[PDB]
């Protein structure tokens, strides 16, 4: 079994950024990697294009997948409003790290976050499953539009979304 790779195509403001690339820990956390998978090409019928990343916190992390209200409450997996914590085997050990919001324990959605410094305290409450492959210059550069309480100075869309293997 190979992990897939998926890609996000990032706008600012409508126009074209870059691309982030990412590694699914399907090895690990095949439950999770599948759904973020699966809301990537949303072959389920519905899924992250067109999406936006509603908090960017510089040295933090940056957060998005709310493609039902477009704000940071809501969100779905492919598997129903929320599923459970599948386990925390991975750890949030650097920039780079892509691991699942929620709103406690097993109410994993949509919503993901992309970390943009270690963040050790999460370990063991969000699930890991994840990491950027390429386009952390893409990611950096995404973080230059946030702020200290997370609101965007510009909007940053996934203008496309994908598989590449
Ligand atoms: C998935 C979604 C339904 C859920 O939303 C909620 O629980 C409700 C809708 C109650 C919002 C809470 C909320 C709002 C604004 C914030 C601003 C700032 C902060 N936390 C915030 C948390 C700071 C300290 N931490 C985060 O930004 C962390 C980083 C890791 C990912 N991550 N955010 C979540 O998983 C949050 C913990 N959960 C949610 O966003």
Same mark, same amino acid.
């Given at each position: 079994?190979?992990? =897939?790779?998926? #890609?996000? *195509? $990032?706008? /600012?403001?409508?126009?074209?950024?870059?691309?982030?690339?990412?590694? @699914?820990? !399907?090895?690990?956390? =095949?439950?999770? !990697?599948?759904?973020?998978? !699966?809301?990537? %090409?949303?072959?389920?019928?519905?899924?992250?294009?067109?999406?936006?990343?509603?908090?960017?916190? =510089?040295? #933090?992390?940056?957060?998005?997948?709310?493609?039902?209200?477009?704000?940071? %409450?809501?969100?779905?997996? $492919?598997?129903?409003?929320?599923?459970?914590?599948?386990?925390?085997?991975?750890?949030?050990?650097? =920039?780079?790290?892509?691991?699942?919001?929620? !709103?406690?324990?097993?109410?994993?959605?949509?919503?993901?976050? $992309?970390?943009?410094?270690?963040?050790?305290? @999460? *370990?063991?409450?969000? /699930?890991?499953?994840?990491? /950027?492959?390429?386009?952390?210059? $893409? /990611?950096?550069?995404?973080?230059?539009?946030?702020?200290?309480?997370?609101? %965007?100075?510009?909007?940053?869309?996934?203008?496309?979304?994908?598989?590449?293997?």
């Amino acid at each position: 079994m190979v992990n =897939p790779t998926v #890609f996000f *195509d $990032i706008a /600012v403001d409508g126009e074209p950024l870059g691309r982030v690339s990412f590694e @699914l820990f !399907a090895d690990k956390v =095949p439950k999770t !990697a599948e759904n973020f998978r !699966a809301l990537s %090409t949303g072959e389920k019928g519905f899924g992250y294009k067109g999406s936006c990343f509603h908090r960017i916190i =510089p040295g #933090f992390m940056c957060q998005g997948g709310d493609f039902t209200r477009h704000n940071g %409450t809501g969100g779905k997996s $492919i598997y129903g409003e929320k599923f459970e914590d599948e386990n925390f085997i991975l750890k949030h050990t650097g =920039p780079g790290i892509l691991s699942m919001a929620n !709103a406690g324990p097993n109410t994993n959605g949509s919503q993901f976050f $992309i970390c943009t410094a270690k963040t050790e305290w @999460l *370990d063991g409450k969000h /699930v890991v499953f994840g990491k /950027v492959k390429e386009g952390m210059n $893409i /990611v950096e550069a995404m973080e230059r539009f946030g702020s200290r309480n997370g609101k %965007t100075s510009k909007k940053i869309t996934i203008a496309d979304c994908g598989q590449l293997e």
